[PDB]
Structure formats: structure tokens, C-alpha cells
């Protein structure tokens, strides 16, 4: 099937001799415009306490909200160099996001940021979040503020399964009350092989999130709470599209849970970081980094069934913290005009950075 208009739009030279690629091009939706297509500007440094600082990791910025005349952002913060996993795991810092707490900063212009103080810290020895609390996002509901984040219980071994903690407050400045129990855990059905600390050696891989549940982000949606997350699997494979990473959602009736994973998981087949937002009654999601559908912006009318809306150039701003103060409903990608991100200055220390993006115009 095809019209004359479609043939002309596609530049197809002979409808009696359609190449494989032209056949794929004729399956693209004809009513899908260019308004999901965007390009990022160069990453820009931040001023004040969010400038690079030797000896300190500040990374993985949350979404930004505005309260009290000020932008707020939450982020992972640790100090000291990273050794990695070849030595004493009880003693060393295995990743830059090991040994973290969650701190926060505010800004009147989104450029000069004042680090205010800790928001959420590691629990006492033996608790589920004693090793590191890190990789945070922010949700507001009915005048309360919620931070969901990754937790690790010591030791931070290659094979450890992280969980997700939740903390709440009555002001964006805290103080915050942590949940006594994690709100989300990886699947329980993988099975390791042997005793070596090797995340690739398994007897059974288990579900797509049998190892890790990452980048938790909660969107109040349809009167319920949709926690989108990234699974890593035990025995993760590399495919024609790279690392095999997929996204899930878990849904709660109330902010504090219980969050029950959707039978439709995984709700992506690709991606890495979680970057999602409600738009026109549904949920938009930027899929990046890994997988056959990396570098796409996707949209689900029901937060579950995502369709490709654009295929964009490789995205330079990783782990985006979305500008939630934007006029999100104006345009599918209005929320992405600016926001926060980070950059690997070096293997030990990273810093938060600001990005911009624009639609392309002829």
C-alpha cells in the first residue's frame, strides 16, 4: 500500500521495484510529524557549588521543581577516589556512586547553584541502605514531597542486588523521613553460578530485572503512582543492539506503596537511564544508550504501550534530570528545552552540567 503523495515524500523511484529499505520506509506512520525530533546543544558547566570540585562526586541529578522562588535539585554526592572491585570490598569505594548520600541544591536562575545540605543519608550498619543511597528522583503529591532512590546493603559486591528506598517531607528543604522497608527490589528468580564475583556467570538469568532496579522515577498518573525503572539482568547479554537492558514499571494506589510490577514488563525493549514525563494524557520516554531502539523518543497513551515518535542523533546529555517547571503540555519536547545532566570529568570525579535542546527548523 502507498499514495502518490507518500511516494513523492519518500523519493521512491519505482513502485514496481521496491527495495527492502523502501518497504520499511512505507511502514512508517504518515501522520507522524517532526515535532518529537530534537537536537542537543553543547553541555554547559554550572556555577556556585555545582561547578566541578576535585575530590567530590556530584552526579545523577533528579528532576528540577520550583518552590519558594527557587529551583531545587537532588543528587548523589560522595568523596574520595574509586578503587573498583579488585581489592577489599568492605573497605573500598567500588563505583563513584558507592559511599553516597543524597544532597540537594537551589538556584534562582538555574545556573548558579547553592548546595544546601544532605537530604537523605545512609542508614545504620546492617540496614538495607547502609552502604550507599544514590540515584534519586523527586515527585510531589498533595503538598508532600517524595524522593525515591537506589540503596545498597553492604558489601557492595559485583553480585549485590540494589533496592529502591523512598523518603518523604513536608518541605522541599526536608527534613526527610525514610521508609523502614525498600519499595522495590529486583526479581527473585536468577541463580548465580559458582562463587566468583561475576555478574555474567549464571545457572538461570531470571527476569529482565533479576540483578538491578535502577533510576527509579515516580509519575503520579491516572490516580495511581507509576514507578518507572531500569532493570539489569543477571547474565546480561550483548545483542545486535548492544547491552540488553529494558525498562519496567510498578504501579501503587498510594505514594508510599505497595508498588506492584506490571504484568506488561518490560515496557521497553531498549534504553538505559529513565527519563519520562506525562504528556497529553499519556507518558513520554527518552530511550538512550543501549539497545536497538536507543536514541528514540517514545510515547504511550496508557503509560504502558510505547510507540516510537522520533529517532534523534546520539544524545550527549546522559541521566537527564528533567525541567518539571516547564510548560510540559505546550509541545511534546517542551520539557527538554533545558535541564540538568552530568559529565565524566574523569574516572573518580563527575559533576552536574546543564543542557539545552531544540527542534530542528529548515
Which residues of this protein are in contact with Cl ion, per CB under 5 A? 162
Site for its own copies in 159-188 (CB under 8 A): 187
Binding partner of 162, given its own copies, Zn ion, Cl ion, none, CB within 5-8 angstroms per partner class? Cl ion
Site for its own copies in 297-326 (CB under 8 A): 298, 300, 304-315
- Residue 270, phi then psi, degrees to nearest 5: -150, 180
Which of 319, 326, 328, 352 contacts Zn ion by CB under 5 A? 319
Q: What is the largest CA-CA distance in the chain?
A: 71
Which of 60, 129, 207, 215 contacts its own copies by CB under 8 A? 207
Binding partner of 21, given its own copies, Cl ion, Zn ion, none, CB within 5-8 angstroms per partner class? its own copies
Cell output for 132: 550507599
Of the two residues 102 and 267, which places its CB atom closer to Zn ion in the complex? 102
Of the two residues 162 and 288, which places its CB atom closer to Cl ion in the complex? 162
Q: Which residues contact 241 (CB under 8 A, 6 or more apart)?
A: 270, 290, 291, 292, 293, 294
Binding partner of 60, given its own copies, Zn ion, Cl ion, none, CB within 5-8 angstroms per partner class? Zn ion
* Residue 353 makes contact with Zn ion by CB under 5 A: no
Of the two residues 186 and 255, which places its CB atom closer to Cl ion in the complex? 186
Distance CA 220, CA 154 (A): 32
Q: Which residues contact 63 (CB under 8 A, 6 or more apart)?
A: 73, 137, 138, 217, 321, 322, 323, 324, 339
CB of 333 to Cl ion, least distance (A): 30
Q: Which residue is nearest to Cl ion (CB)?
A: 162
CB of 89 to its own copies, least distance (A): 20
Binding partner of 293, given Zn ion, Cl ion, its own copies, none, CB within 5-8 angstroms per partner class? its own copies
The answer, yes or no, to whether the previous bond of 155 is cis (omega within 30 of 0) is yes
Binding partner of 319, given Zn ion, Cl ion, its own copies, none, CB within 5-8 angstroms per partner class? Zn ion
Q: Of 172, 202, 169, 178, nearest to 124 (Cα)?
A: 178
Which of 40, 57, 58, 60 contacts Zn ion by CB under 5 A? 60
Site for Zn ion in 16-35 (CB under 5 A): none
* Residue 294 makes contact with its own copies by CB under 8 A: yes
First to last CA, the chain: 29
Cell output for 63: 528532576
CB of 349 to its own copies, least distance (A): 19
Of the two residues 319 and 328, which places its CB atom closer to Zn ion in the complex? 319
Which of 104, 208, 259, 355 contacts its own copies by CB under 8 A? 208
Q: Which residue intervals of 150-270 are DSSP H helices?
A: none
Q: Which residues contact 129 (CB under 8 A, 6 or more apart)?
A: 122, 123, 151, 152, 153, 163, 165, 178, 182
Length reported for the chain: 362
Cell output for 221: 498518573
Of the two residues 78 and 162, which places its CB atom closer to Cl ion in the complex? 162
* Residue 193 makes contact with its own copies by CB under 8 A: no
- Residue 335, phi then psi, degrees to nearest 5: -60, -30
Q: Of 159, 265, 260, 262, nearest to 207 (Cα)?
A: 265
* Residue 280 makes contact with its own copies by CB under 8 A: no
Site for its own copies in 241-270 (CB under 8 A): 241-242, 244, 246, 248, 261-270
Of the two residues 64 and 300, which places its CB atom closer to Zn ion in the complex? 64
Residue 67 exposed, middle or buried by CB count within 10 Å (0-12, 13-18, 19+): middle
DSSP 8-class letter at 323: B
* Residue 273 makes contact with its own copies by CB under 8 A: no
Which positions touch Zn ion (CB under 5 A)?
60, 215, 319
Amino acid at each position: 500500500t502507498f499514495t502518490p503523495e507518500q511516494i513523492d515524500h519518500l523519493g521512491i523511484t519505482d513502485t514496481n521495484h521496491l527495495s527492502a529499505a523502501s518497504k520499511r520506509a512505507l511502514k512508517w506512520p504518515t501522520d507522524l510529524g517532526n515535532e518529537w525530533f530534537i537536537q542537543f546543544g553543547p553541555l554547559q558547566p554550572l556555577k556556585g557549588d555545582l561547578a566541578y570540585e576535585e575530590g567530590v562526586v556530584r552526579r545523577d541529578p533528579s528532576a528540577i521543581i520550583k518552590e519558594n522562588g527557587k529551583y531545587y535539585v537532588w543528587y548523589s554526592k560522595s568523596t574520595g577516589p574509586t578503587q573498583g572491585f579488585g581489592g577489599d570490598i568492605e573497605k573500598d569505594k567500588v563505583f563513584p556512586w558507592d559511599r553516597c548520600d543524597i544532597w540537594y541544591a537551589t538556584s534562582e536562575d538555574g545556573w548558579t547553584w547553592k548546595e544546601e545540605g544532605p537530604a537523605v543519608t545512609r542508614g545504620e550498619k546492617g540496614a538495607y541502605d547502609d552502604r550507599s543511597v544514590f540515584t534519586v528522583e523527586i515527585m510531589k503529591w498533595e503538598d508532600k514531597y517524595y524522593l525515591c532512590y537506589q540503596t545498597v546493603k553492604s558489601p557492595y559486591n559485583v553480585r549485590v542486588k540494589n533496592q529502591v528506598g523512598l523518603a518523604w517531607a513536608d518541605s522541599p528543604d526536608g527534613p526527610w523521613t525514610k521508609s523502614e522497608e525498600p519499595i522495590l527490589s529486583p526479581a527473585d528468580n536468577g541463580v548465580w553460578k559458582g562463587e566468583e564475583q561475576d555478574r555474567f556467570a549464571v545457572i538461570k538469568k531470571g527476569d529482565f530485572d533479576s540483578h538491578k532496579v535502577h533510576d527509579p522515577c515516580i509519575i503520579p498518573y491516572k490516580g495511581k503512582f507509576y514507578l518507572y525503572y531500569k532493570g539489569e539482568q543477571m547474565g546480561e547479554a550483548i545483542t545486535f543492539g548492544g547491552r540488553q537492558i529494558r525498562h519496567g514499571v510498578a504501579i501503587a494506589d498510594n505514594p508510599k506503596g505497595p508498588y506492584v510490577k506490571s504484568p506488561y514488563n518490560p515496557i521497553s525493549n531498549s534504553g538505559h537511564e529513565i527519563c519520562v514525563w506525562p504528556y497529553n494524557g499519556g507518558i513520554a520516554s527518552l530511550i538512550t544508550t543501549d539497545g536497538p531502539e536507543k536514541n528514540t523518543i517514545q510515547w504511550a497513551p496508557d503509560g504502558i504501550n510505547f510507540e516510537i515518535k522520533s529517532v534523534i542523533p546520539g544524545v550527549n546529555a546522559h541521566a537527564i534530570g528533567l525541567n518539571r517547571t516547564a510548560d510540559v503540555e505546550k509541545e511534546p519536547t517542551e520539557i527538554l528545552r533545558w535541564g540538568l545532566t552530568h559529565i565524566y570529568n574523569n574516572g573518580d570525579y563527575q559533576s552536574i552540567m546543564r543542557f539545552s535542546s531544540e527542534r530542528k527548523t529548515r
